[PDB]
């Protein structure tokens, strides 16, 4: 269609208006005094959330240029959520601050490309200073504190995540699922987790979470891909009367002959899913056999000759719950046989003792770690569905924050870490004056998370930011109790990965956003 | 017509919106970093002004309820301008702060009338503390500094006002009038100032200043009020052909047979004005004779028999310039005869030496002070008319501020005095908790001038207000040089009258503005 | 009515848009390659003009804020025209350049008040440098060149003005009036010129020139002010049937019972005018007698007893043409009697020889200079009315430029003088950085006249401005011949007064409007 073309300050102010609308929508959910946001859903009841990425994804504007700015900044929250699962609101606030101050510097007649270069240099130095300032979560041992801070000052969620990490190890898999009671339960059941995703994007279930769940699914395993379609048609017909959703674990699955025909077959009464198998060759067969033994199923092969036409409902495996994500596909509870599971674990341990090759040894330790750790399931208990969704989102944030803390370490929370690493960069300089001004813009935008947190509390952000800048170390402001102190000692811990990722993504998108002179869109 | 009637929070927010529009229009002109405001004029070129009362007077809003609020707060600026001639911007800012915080308190459920009572008590205590904290301008001897600060950091204006007060005394009459060159010139000439005003409001000249000026006026004096018009009809005809506008100085003047017939006679080509004569009986005759001798004219009387029908144009007096105001009517330059003026001065001094009655003695000293002091005329020099008006307004502000300083004293400027008197009232309490909340609202609203001044500088008002509150005495922030120090030593002085008047009028109006529950306006 | 209030950048850009519209309308008439502007007139045929102030006065915009900016900049052209009668386009261009660069500096976050202070300081230093750089027109003797440059490279107009100044002296009065032929003609006749103006603004004739002309007027003189109407009513009636418009020369004339009655008397068939008489007492009587003898009239006085009731048409004086302006009222051609004129000249010269008082001697020399110089009338010859008006405006510009040249001196034309005096100020500095940036803004805006002149020629303003800046002395660019050289030697001379006045008025108004934050107007 015909395109509308805006230039210079008009385009910049329209894009800034869109950015500001999206951020102001998001920024009200920052800190412990931050508030919730009601998101209208055409599907059902409205969703109340404190999650920044949900608000950002829901935001869309009427004006095309403001919508351009809003989408381009929404990219920050989306990337932060994908990378770390937390700090989306902080990333959006940082992007908004960088954009505002960069547009101020652009109005002053400064070269926007040099401003972008200065912002990038300052952010790189800041990331280095964060890596230097980070303190490992193993040394601190404050997993409960990280989970509590991430769960909006919820002690129970933090203690639950700490217990779950104590049971299945600091690296064991944990899955958050809806509970049934009014209290949060921790279930440590048998399951199997592998980094694989669904082949087709249509397999997503009704909720927009991007991960499809199957209620009491059925397990199908195979290592060789068969040519014809009619051969497993009796299997699908048996699946068409087993009553349980079918999950297909094989080497790889296509769509033109399987996904399209199955889409045209039924209207979605029962969701049929297919996933890849991790590894290749002998390893793929090994994990396929392990999964089959876990779920009580069997794996077909050329050597065995166990053709699917002879496969029955009893032969194939079954699980109580399976959740499939593009990043990683997990099995929540595969019944199988407990004695069979223990025997397989003993056999794999004996293989570990016998094996000596470093690659074989390490993959065998990975297998036994997956088997022994199991699947830790946290039941989100709430009296209503809206509270179920809200608390489930909070527990997911706590889980991601704890994972980031164990993977990379922790820093003082409440924006104090960015305040500190901004003070150490006061002597950083660039090639020219515009680059130096961009560096200063990046340094000022690092106070934005703390200033926003204080603004949500009703206090004065300038005074509190100055007071925190006057301190040293982990000295900062406790937004929950309206007093200053040591952020680490007060248990307000933020993962280093979350802060670094938010800073980096906000920096990239915002620095690209201040070099824009013309914007083209429809009419 | 039919009335639109609003209730409760809707009426309160409409009123607050109007108040905020007016105050935001006014508040941009506060402090040395305050900016000018352009007022569109239907007559000619737009007026550029930093004066708060002009902006407030020009503000009028489309929405009827918002217009209610705007007029209600414009009352504050008008009252402050009338009382002190300075501090209209500060008064408007204080009223806006009181209104906003009182509406916040009302939304919290506080009783608005008790809040108003608490605000009144706090403001009375603050006025007492201002009187206690005031420092006389005679002891300080900083007239030049007061004028310079009042003239928006113009050293030349302050030095000019200091010289004028040195010449005609600290109580002499000083008049600001348009000059001709590009430089400000001070002229000390012979004239008379007496506290009387125009009888009819029709006499207002084309400018909205409220005071009519006459270019080379003619002087008419009389102590007896004659009945029939036809006796002065030859006099009026001679006046209506002499070429110089007529000023009538007599006991008292009507409008139904004088102003109405004049309006029906003249269309405004040459203005004819009539003023009252100060004093009564013998005193009125004495001042009439003094004015006639000053302008070279004569005074008619029944005893003398000097009938106006025989009066000629040469017999009547003449002045080079006369300015008439409702509060006080002054004669700028009456030629008369210098020898006659000196002889009259000597005669009145001899009368002083002969007289012994306290009332007669004091009125004779007032007469000789009026004659000896003369009229100090300040010629505003500007290359254009807009600069003429702007600099004339600034010089008028300096004049009023210096008068208030000599009359009442000075306090630390830049909102520091209100900050200091806010801390001294921290222990003040009212009858109930509502009154205490009102007192705290009044105390917080008294930081508004300093915070607004700092905001205009582009600094952070919270931090600077905190730093000033942490000091003591005359410690404060220099908005002109962006540094702290002793307000008095740095030369930024505010008259105690101006600050006290702004506080009191803002308090009265704003406190009455938060007790509203219904608004009744047209449709 | 309800007011529209705009803040910050919105008001700034609206006012800048109005300023730019008015200037772009005006700026096309700058330099020798500048073009004409057609102005619609409801009175009659459209007017083609190259005069800046005419275009500025005709400009009025639909949007209220843009209209405010346009009016405020129109003030620059009006003030320049009033002060110097030339350089109004240069004044408007300088104002526009200052406004644009000051708004650019304001967008950069710089204090507008300090920018205004820096602009004022730079302009003051520039005026001093212009006074230093000025070269007297007596030493140069290039009156023809000044008139030719001012008359849009018209050699005949310059030579005519040079001849007139030679005939009547460098200070003698010259009047431009419509001719009858197709050629410009110079007439040196007998007349009277005195610095007085019309008492009432209603007396302005049909054209908007602000000066009323009377076709074969009648002369009325008086030294004593008359009282009633009925004693001169026969005199007016004789005047009201003599056939020639009446000019009243007296001490001072009112409007209440004289202007209003005469306005109600006629609808505008024959204009009756009254003017003041310069001087007082004996001097006023002396000039009244001189004017009466020049026009063959008589003077009414109390001592003589010659009462107006007995005055006849033959007794009163008559003139061939009279032009009345607020600044100065002149008599173009008074017939009277040549022998009487010569006898009066001889008598006044004898009085000069007899008189010895310095004031009396100097006023007598002024009288004899007025009589001997006479009135030099330039007849503007054109084949049509539009060409009549255009060439008359050009000759008026040449006259004003030549008067300014004799009064103050000349500098190199074509914006070269401002370029030079801007280079000498490159080392000027202010109190702070914002003041320095304002100084630089003023220095850059001084290249604007030259850049606009080159832009009108189709050349590249940047290259030519750089080339002129690289030169020294009066080296510059000849816009008429598209070559560089010495502007003085090439005959392109500009009066120092014109350049200085344009710079000063542009500076004042433009600097006042870069400090505007809010903006109030109707809806
Ligand atoms: N009690 C507290 N006192 C001070 N700061 C706190 C406190 N609790 C949390 N914070 C800080 O507030 C932020 C957490 O807020 P929140 O989790 O709502 O936002 P986020 O991390 O940007 O991401 P998201 O909204 O997507 O979860 C972190 O910067 C954390 O350090
Ligand atoms: N250099 C300065 N530093 C700090 N404060 C200053 C300075 N100059 C003036 N002030 C303060 O700013 C105020 C004067 O500003 P401004 O003249 O604009 O407003 P006003 O006096 O309230 O009234 P109005 O606008 O009617 O003249 C006073 O409170 C004065 O003490
Ligand atoms: N031949 C020329 N070469 C270069 N510059 C010239 C030449 N003739 C005139 N100028 C310059 O052009 C300007 C005169 O232009 P113009 O008379 O059209 O403008 P103006 O007097 O400002 O306008 P307006 O008549 O509307 O008041 C002066 O700066 C003069 O020095
Ligand atoms: Mg978070
Ligand atoms: Mg003031
Ligand atoms: Mg010209």
A310 Cβ neighbours under 8 A, 6+ residues apart: none
Q: What is the CATH number of the domain that holds C300?
A: 3.50.7.10
Residue with tokens 């500094």: B145
Around ion ligand 6, residues with a beta carbon closer than 5 Å are C 86, 150, 397
Helix or strand holding residue B444 (H, E): helix B433-445
B-contacting residues of C 86-145, CB under 8 Å? Answer: 109, 111-113
| DSSP category for residue B300 | B
| Angstrom distance (rounded) from CA C343 to CA A87 | 104
C156 is in an annotated binding site: no
Per-residue CA distances from C294 to B292, B519, C276 (Å): 40, 75, 18
Task: Report the Cα–Cα distance between both ends of chain A, in Å, rounded.
Answer: 8
Chain C residues inside the 8 Å CB shell of A111: none
As a whole number of Å, the CA-based R_g of chain A is 26
| Angstrom distance (rounded) from CA C350 to CA C344 | 10
A287 and A305 part of one domain: yes
B-contacting residues of C 187-246, CB under 8 Å? Answer: 199-200, 202, 225-229
Per-residue CA distances from C102 to A102, C127, C435, C440 (Å): 21, 20, 11, 10
Q: Confirm if B88 and B79 have CB atoms less than 8 A apart.
A: no
As a whole number of Å, the CA-based R_g of chain C is 26
A182 and A282 part of one domain: no
The neighbouring-strand residues paired with A246 are: A218
Method: cryo-EM
B515 and B441 part of one domain: yes
| Angstrom distance (rounded) from CA A85 to CA A521 | 32
Annotate C14-34 with DSSP letters as a single string: HHHHHHHHHHHHHHTT-STT-
A352 and A253 part of one domain: yes
Would you state the structure tokens that stand for residue C404, as one six-digit string? Answer: 């300014």
For ligand 1, say whether the CB of A449 is within 6 Å of any of its atoms. yes
- Specify the 3-state DSSP secondary structure of A490: coil
Q: Confirm if C210 and C204 have CB atoms less than 8 A apart.
A: yes
Per-residue CA distances from C296 to B190, C334, C348, C371 (Å): 43, 8, 17, 15
Name the residue facing B35 among C112, C200, C225 (closest C-beta): C112
| Angstrom distance (rounded) from CA A429 to CA A438 | 10
Interface check A469 vs B, CB under 8 A: no
Chain C residues inside the 8 Å CB shell of A108: 107-109
Residue with tokens 């600050």: B499
Chain B residues inside the 8 Å CB shell of C251: 242-243
Cα dihedral sign, A386-A388-A392-A394? positive
C391 is in an annotated binding site: no
* Cβ neighbours of C482 (radius 10 Å): 13
Interface check A447 vs B, CB under 8 A: no
With CA atoms as reference, report the closest residue to A455 among A73, A110, A3, A27: A27
For ligand 1, say whether the CB of A89 is within 6 Å of any of its atoms. yes
B151 and B217 part of one domain: no
Query: Mutual orientation of helices C461-470 and C416-423 as an angle, nearest 10°?
Result: 60
| Angstrom distance (rounded) from CA B435 to CA B412 | 29
| DSSP category for residue C125 | H
Look at strands A173-178 and A375-380 and give their pairing.
parallel
The neighbouring-strand residues paired with A220 are: A248
Query: How many angstroms does the Cα of residue A29 sit away from the middle of ligand 1?
Result: 9
C202 and C145 part of one domain: no
| B289 CB-contact burial (10 Å; exposed 0-12 / middle 13-18 / buried 19+) | middle
**Closest chain B residue by Cα to residue C65:** B40
Known binding-site residue numbers of B for ATP: 29-32, 50, 86-90, 414, 478-480, 494
Task: Report the Cα–Cα distance between both ends of chain C, in Å, rounded.
Answer: 8
Helix or strand holding residue A12 (H, E): helix A8-27
Query: How many angstroms does the Cα of residue A495 sit away from the middle of ligand 1?
Result: 11
SS3 labels along A385-416: HHHHHHHHHHHHHHHHHHHHHHHHCEEECCCH
Give the range of the structural domain holding residue B229, as residue numbers without chain letter: 191-371
Per-residue CA distances from A327 to A194, A203, A211, C186, C430 (Å): 9, 14, 10, 99, 63
B145 and B111 part of one domain: no
Count of positions (residues) in chain A = 523
| Angstrom distance (rounded) from CA B221 to CA B248 | 6
Q: Indicate the top mutation candidate among A89, A142, A148, A495 to test ligand 1's pocket, ranked by most ligand atoms within 8 A of CB.
A: A89
Find the DSSP H helices in C409-495. Answer: 416-423, 433-445, 448-457, 461-470
Q: Confirm if B149 and B138 have CB atoms less than 8 A apart.
A: no
Would you state the structure tokens that stand for residue C516, as one six-digit string? Answer: 């505007």
The neighbouring-strand residues paired with A186 are: A378
C32 Cβ neighbours under 8 A, 6+ residues apart: C152, C153, C479, C480
* Cβ neighbours of C62 (radius 10 Å): 6
With CA atoms as reference, report the closest residue to B30 among B469, B449, B419: B449
Which chains contact A through at least 3 pairs of Cβ atoms less than 8 Å apart? B, C
Residue with tokens 């600290």: B170
- Specify the 3-state DSSP secondary structure of C213: strand
Q: What is the CATH number of the domain that holds A149?
A: 3.30.260.10
B124 and B6 part of one domain: yes
- Phi/psi-derived region of residue B442, left when phi > 0, alpha when psi is between -120 and 50, beta in every other case: alpha
C496 is in an annotated binding site: no
With CA atoms as reference, report the closest residue to C414 among C460, C464, C458: C464
Chain C residues inside the 8 Å CB shell of B383: 79, 504-505, 507-508
The neighbouring-strand residues paired with B193 are: B330
CB-CB under 8 Å, C256 with B266:
yes
Interface check C444 vs A, CB under 8 A: no
Interface check C44 vs B, CB under 8 A: no
Residue with tokens 């003085």: C488
With CA atoms as reference, report the closest residue to A334 among A274, A283, A291: A291
Look at strands A246-249 and A218-222 and give their pairing.
parallel
B163 and B227 part of one domain: no
Q: How many CA atoms does the CB half-sphere of C161 hold within 13 Å? A: 31
Ligand 2 atom with least separation from CA of B413: 31
Q: Indicate the top mutation candidate among B89, B485, B487, B506 to test ligand 2's pocket, ranked by most ligand atoms within 8 A of CB.
A: B89
A32 is in an annotated binding site: yes
Per-residue CA distances from B223 to B287, B292, B305 (Å): 10, 12, 12
Would you state the structure tokens that stand for residue B170, as one six-digit string? Answer: 């600290």
| Angstrom distance (rounded) from CA A495 to CA C144 | 85
| Angstrom distance (rounded) from CA C216 to CA C210 | 19
C224 and C362 part of one domain: yes
| Angstrom distance (rounded) from CA B69 to CA B521 | 12
Chain A residues inside the 8 Å CB shell of B466: 460, 463
How many structural domains does chain B have?
Answer: 3
With CA atoms as reference, report the closest residue to C334 among C321, C325, C347, C323: C321
C42 Cβ neighbours under 8 A, 6+ residues apart: none
Query: How many angstroms does the Cα of residue B76 sit away from the middle of ligand 5?
Result: 15
A167 Cβ neighbours under 8 A, 6+ residues apart: A186, A188, A376
Q: Confirm if A100 and A16 have CB atoms less than 8 A apart.
A: yes
Q: Confirm if C332 and C321 have CB atoms less than 8 A apart.
A: yes
Find how far residue A488's CA is from the centre of its chain: 25
| A66 CB-contact burial (10 Å; exposed 0-12 / middle 13-18 / buried 19+) | buried
B225 and B347 part of one domain: yes
C235 and C308 part of one domain: yes
Q: Confirm if A441 and A115 have CB atoms less than 8 A apart.
A: yes
The neighbouring-strand residues paired with B215 are: B321
What is the experimental resolution, given in Å to one decimal place?
3.2
| Angstrom distance (rounded) from CA A389 to CA A49 | 8
Taking CA atoms only, the protein residue closest to ligand 1 atom 11 is A414
| Angstrom distance (rounded) from CA B249 to CA B276 | 6
């Amino acid at each position: 269609a015909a395109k509308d073309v805006k230039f210079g300050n008009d385009a910049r102010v329209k894009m800034l208006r869109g950015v500001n609308v999206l951020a102001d929508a998001v920024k009200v959910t920052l800190g412990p005094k931050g508030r919730n946001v009601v998101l209208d859903k055409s599907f059902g009841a409205p969703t109340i959330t404190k999650d920044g990425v949900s608000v950002a994804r829901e935001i869309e504007l009427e004006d095309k240029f403001e919508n351009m700015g809003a989408q381009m900044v929404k990219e920050v929250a989306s990337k932060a959520n994908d990378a770390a699962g937390d700090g989306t609101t902080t990333a959006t606030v940082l992007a908004q601050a960088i954009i505002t101050e960069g547009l101020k510097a652009v109005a002053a007649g400064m070269n926007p490309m040099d401003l972008k270069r200065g912002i990038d240099k300052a952010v790189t130095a800041a990331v280095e200073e964060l890596k230097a300032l980070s303190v490992p979560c193993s040394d601190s041992k404050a997993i409960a504190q990280v989970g509590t801070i991430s769960a909006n000052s919820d002690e129970t969620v933090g203690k639950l995540i700490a217990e779950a990490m104590d049971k299945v190890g600091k690296e064991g898999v944990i899955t958050v699922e809806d509970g049934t009671g009014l209290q949060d339960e921790l279930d440590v059941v048998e399951g199997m987790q592998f980094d694989r995703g669904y082949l087709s994007p249509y397999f997503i279930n009704k909720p927009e979470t991007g991960a499809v769940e199957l209620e009491s699914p059925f397990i199908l395993l195979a290592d060789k891909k068969i040519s014809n379609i009619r051969e497993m048609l009796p299997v699908l017909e048996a699946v068409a009367k087993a009553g349980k959703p079918l999950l297909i674990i094989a080497e790889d699955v296509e769509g033109e002959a399987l996904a399209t025909l199955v889409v045209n077959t039924m209207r979605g009464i029962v969701k049929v899913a297919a996933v890849k198998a991790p590894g290749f060759g002998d390893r793929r067969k090994a994990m396929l056999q392990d999964i089959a033994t876990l779920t009580g199923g069997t794996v077909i092969s050329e050597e065995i000759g166990m053709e699917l036409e002879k496969a029955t409902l009893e032969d194939l495996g079954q699980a109580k719950r399976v959740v499939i994500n593009k990043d990683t596909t997990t099995i929540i509870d595969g019944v199988g046989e407990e004695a069979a599971i223990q025997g397989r674990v003993a056999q794999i341990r004996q293989q570990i003792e016998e094996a000596t090759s470093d690659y074989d040894r390490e993959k065998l330790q990975e297998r036994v770690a997956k088997l022994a750790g199991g699947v830790a399931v946290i039941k989100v208990g709430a009296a209503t569905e809206v509270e179920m969704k809200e608390k489930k989102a909070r527990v997911e944030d706590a889980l991601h924050a704890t994972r980031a803390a164990v993977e990379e370490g922790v820093v003082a929370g409440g924006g104090v870490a960015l305040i500190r690493v901004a003070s150490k960069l006061a002597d950083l300089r660039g090639q020219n004056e515009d680059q130096n001004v961009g560096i200063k813009v990046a340094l000022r935008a690092m106070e934005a998370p703390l200033r926003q947190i204080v603004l949500n509390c009703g206090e004065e952000p300038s005074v509190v930011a100055n007071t925190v800048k006057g301190g040293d170390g982990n000295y900062g402001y406790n937004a929950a109790t309206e007093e200053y102190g040591n952020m680490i000692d007060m248990g307000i811990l933020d993962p280093t990965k979350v802060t670094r990722s938010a800073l980096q993504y906000a920096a990239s998108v915002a620095g690209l956003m201040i070099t824009t002179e013309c914007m083209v869109t429809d009419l």
